[PDB]
Amino acid sequence: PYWEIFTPENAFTPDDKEQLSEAITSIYVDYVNLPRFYVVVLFKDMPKETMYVGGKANNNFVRIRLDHIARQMETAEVRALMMTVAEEKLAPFIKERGYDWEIHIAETPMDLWRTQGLVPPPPESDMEKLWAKENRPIPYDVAASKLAAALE
Template identity: 80%
Template sequence: MPYWEIFTPENAYTPEDKEQLAEAITSIYVDYANLPKFYVVVLFKDMPANTMYVGGKPADNFVRIRVDHIARQMDDPQMRFLCMEVIEEKLAPFVKERGYDWEVHIDETAMDLWRTQGLVPPPPESDMEKLWAKENRAVPYEGAS
């Protein structure tokens, strides 16, 4: 799963903004990695004033994004570069174009350390994963637990 935590200044985004950004993030994984939509989780954390510090100083105009990739790994440096370019493009209307300072990083977790609905996710690009994408939910299958 791609799991995103987005730390933002309090009231930086409306509920509509959050939904649009979550949809933009989801589209990255659906369009470029063929992942089921439900794999993508986005958590917004509104930070009250004087709770985020950069360089020891309050950073009340700062958006920090932490991403964890599990469903796919990126071993190729060019793929990593392209991924970061797409992410920056999708984020731009929500950070850059609104005048926020921002930072984003990606960690990658081994797929065998992940379960969803208690099931082992199917192998990437498998027929079962395609079924999960079509159904937009985890579907039990033999060998999934």
């Protein structure tokens, strides 16, 4: 997953960013045992008078946008749950500190994606589980792993 979090300048401490990115990472670990390092969160500090909401500068506004690449969400229930859990993780850092905020997700093609130059392994495959356990992208025989994964 690819997350962008646009904040008022200096809204979050380094410890805040660690804690919040950990919470966001836990979504994908807990619900789909994704390798932790798949989860990328980019914090973007926005200076005053750079975020305009409804045509007026808003310096108390956090805008979040994310791509999902590894998995598709194929039912209304699963899609609603993703939004529900995302807001649950964000609330201690954003809602509960009095910020205004908005979030949206896009789904992008799984096959147009490389990490450390490698083809990520198939969902729920042994190699994906290995990548998760090691928490690093391990070079592997893509065809061999795909073949065995298809016969699971």
